[PDB]
Amino acid sequence: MDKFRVQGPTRLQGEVTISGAKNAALPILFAALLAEEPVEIQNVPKLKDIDTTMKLLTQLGTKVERXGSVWIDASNVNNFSAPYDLVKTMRASIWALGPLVARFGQGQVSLPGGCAIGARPVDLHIFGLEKLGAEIKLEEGYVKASVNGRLKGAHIVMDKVSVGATVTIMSAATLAEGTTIIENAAREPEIVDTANFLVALGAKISGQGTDRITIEGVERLGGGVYRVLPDRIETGTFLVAAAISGGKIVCRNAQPDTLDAVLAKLREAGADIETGEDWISLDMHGKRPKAVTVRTAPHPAFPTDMQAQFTLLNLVAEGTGVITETIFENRFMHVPELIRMGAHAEIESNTVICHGVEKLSGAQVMATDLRASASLVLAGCIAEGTTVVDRIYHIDRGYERIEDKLRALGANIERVKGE
Numbered sequence: 001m002d003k004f005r006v007q008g009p010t011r012l013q014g015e016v017t018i019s020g021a022k023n024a025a026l027p028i029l030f031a032a033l034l035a036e037e038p039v040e041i042q043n044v045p046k047l048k049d050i051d052t053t054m055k056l057l058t059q060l061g062t063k064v065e066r067x068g069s070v071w072i073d074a075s076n077v078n079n080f081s082a083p084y085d086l087v088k089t090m091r092a093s094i095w096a097l098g099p100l101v102a103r104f105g106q107g108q109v110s111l112p113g114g115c116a117i118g119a120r121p122v123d124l125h126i127f128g129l130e131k132l133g134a135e136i137k138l139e140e141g142y143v144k145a146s147v148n149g150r151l152k153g154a155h156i157v158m159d160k161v162s163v164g165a166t167v168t169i170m171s172a173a174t175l176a177e178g179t180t181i182i183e184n185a186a187r188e189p190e191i192v193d194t195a196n197f198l199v200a201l202g203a204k205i206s207g208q209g210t211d212r213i214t215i216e217g218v219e220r221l222g223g224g225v226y227r228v229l230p231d232r233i234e235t236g237t238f239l240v241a242a243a244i245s246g247g248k249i250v251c252r253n254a255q256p257d258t259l260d261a262v263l264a265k266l267r268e269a270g271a272d273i274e275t276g277e278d279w280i281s282l283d284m285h286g287k288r289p290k291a292v293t294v295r296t297a298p299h300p301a302f303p304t305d306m307q308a309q310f311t312l313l314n315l316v317a318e319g320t321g322v323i324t325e326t327i328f329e330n331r332f333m334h335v336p337e338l339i340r341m342g343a344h345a346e347i348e349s350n351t352v353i354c355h356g357v358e359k360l361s362g363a364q365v366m367a368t369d370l371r372a373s374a375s376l377v378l379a380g381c382i383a384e385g386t387t388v389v390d391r392i393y394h395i396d397r398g399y400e401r402i403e404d405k406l407r408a409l410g411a412n413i414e415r416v417k418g419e
């Protein structure tokens with residue numbers, strides 16, 4: 001049971017090279033199930049979720065190898081199930097369903113149960129598949145999808161903006177007969193990425209990145225080489241790390257355009273930001289951040305994955321900051337943890353009201369969220385004394401070598417085993 005032992009405070013200074021987006025590599029790996037020829041996916045981060053996805057793929061009969069790239073050979077898929085033991089550790093596993101039934105006519109994925117973050121049903125995925133002509137049943141806790149022949153293109157309107165369902169439907173539609181239109185599609189950069197990967201394979205897609213995606217199904221998808229875009233959440237997290245430590249940093253291998261809301265918020269916090277084609281620089285000039293007000297919502301608005309990070313910022317900022325969550329209404333586990341470290345805040349429904357304090361004190365805290373829990377490690381870097389973060393296996397799922405990157409910035413951090 002690994003733990004991080006963090007000794008603060010530290011001014012974070014230096015450079016970080018941004019990893020490929022975990023959230024683009026995932027949907028792309030599942031989408032690779034459609035490829036009839038070998039595929040090379042470049043710039044894939046090394047983290048737990050990629051391990052789980054590789055494991056799931058191998059379990060289907062996919063040939064998998066990795067380093068910076070992940071090589072996929074789905075020529076011999078011979079198993080069509082994603083078991084409970086696997087799905088329970090990573091709900092994103094649901095993405096295996098669409099490609100399976102679209103290409104093979106059959107797929108069975110354990111129905112995801114509860115997730116600590118909040119209510120996260122996959123009704124939209126199933127709805128999308130059915131509209132495509134798939135027959136779906138629930139047996140023994142398994143979602144069983146089937147179709148005799150090809151799926152069928154359809155005009156679908158989304159009851160909610162959904163990253164997951166948009167990917168399920170979009171992916172499955174590339175092999176359908178006819179044209180599919182997804183109305184009220186999610187606009188996330190990862191969706192544009194996945195679509196581009198599909199297009200590189202031979203798929204016909206347009207509108208990716210807009211609220212309206214159109215797919216013209218083809219008979220088969222080939223193979224190819226595709227480079228995954230930079231991780232916007234990793235980038236935001238590092239920018240925040242610098243901004244709350246009076247620091248200075250340059251992010252390499254970045255994609256500024258995927259970060260508008262976060263950059264504008266950092267500027268409001270008082271950060272001096274410059275951007276280039278593939279880089280972002282942030283300098284606090286040793287200043288304490290200014291509290292900001294944030295509202296999470298579908299891309300390009302402020303993302304829920306940067307939420308806890310900004311809550312932290314608000315917590316050591318000057319002034320009252322307010323954070324409202326409209327995606328995962330209960331994604332506030334980090335708050336009582338930070339309050340253990342001396343922070344001040346009240347949760348009213350889906351909103352956290354922050355009362356910035358001058359300094360945090362080191363304490364024992366518990367990670368629970370693969371993205372938001374990074375805020376606990378960030379807090380440890382600027383808190384007075386020693387902070388011990390328990391359950392880092394969560395963070396291991398969403399960040400490539402977070403200790404290494406922080407350490408290269410001056411952080412005093414140690415991975416503790418057992419003890």
Ligand SMILES: CC(=O)N[C@H]1[C@@H](OP(=O)(O)OP(=O)(O)OC[C@H]2O[C@@H](n3ccc(=O)[nH]c3=O)[C@H](O)[C@@H]2O)O[C@H](CO)[C@@H](O)[C@@H]1O[C@H](C)C(=O)O
Nearest residue numbers: 023092119120121122123124125160162163164165327371
């Ligand atoms: C693997 C991956 O990319 N996961 C990401 C993706 O989750 P996803 O699951 O697709 O999110 P949604 O469908 O956009 O979530 C949409 C909202 O709508 C509801 N909804 C979603 C689908 C559905 O069928 N029915 C339905 O009701 C849902 O409850 C949520 O409130 O998008 C989230 C928001 O950006 C991210 O926080 C999440 O990252 C996480 C941390 C991670 O890296 O593990």
